[PDB]
């Protein structure tokens, strides 16, 4: 029974996977963001931060800095509370 590992194997593969990228990602395309939300807001009129993040490949603070400029968060929404859009 509980037997002597250098490190548990699940944590080992979590690390070996975090050897792929970094969650503190780069960014160059500020115009890109609106392209997807054009087509996809019919699925979610307001998308969560966790929604945008995987569709994009950008860090959270920079994406939020942009999402301040582009849209507003729907604090009180029928489905949930997340980030709506100004049409323009």
């Amino acid at each position: 029974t509980n037997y002597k590992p250098v490190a548990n194997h699940q944590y080992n593969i979590e690390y070996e996977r975090k050897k792929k990228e970094d969650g503190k990602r780069a960014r160059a395309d500020k115009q890109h963001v609106l392209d997807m939300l054009f087509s996809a807001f019919e699925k979610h009129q307001y998308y969560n931060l966790k929604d945008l993040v995987d569709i994009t490949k950008q860090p959270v603070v920079y994406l939020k800095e942009i999402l301040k400029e582009i849209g507003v968060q729907n604090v009180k929404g029928i489905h949930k509370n997340t980030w709506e859009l100004k049409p323009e």
């Binding site: 115009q31 609106l34 392209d35 939300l37 054009f38 087509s39 582009i70 049409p87 323009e88």
Partner: peptide, 10 residues
């Protein structure tokens, strides 16, 4: 239409 909102941002 998305390019249009981009023009608005421009």
């Amino acid at each position: 239409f998305g390019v249009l909102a981009k023009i608005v941002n421009y």
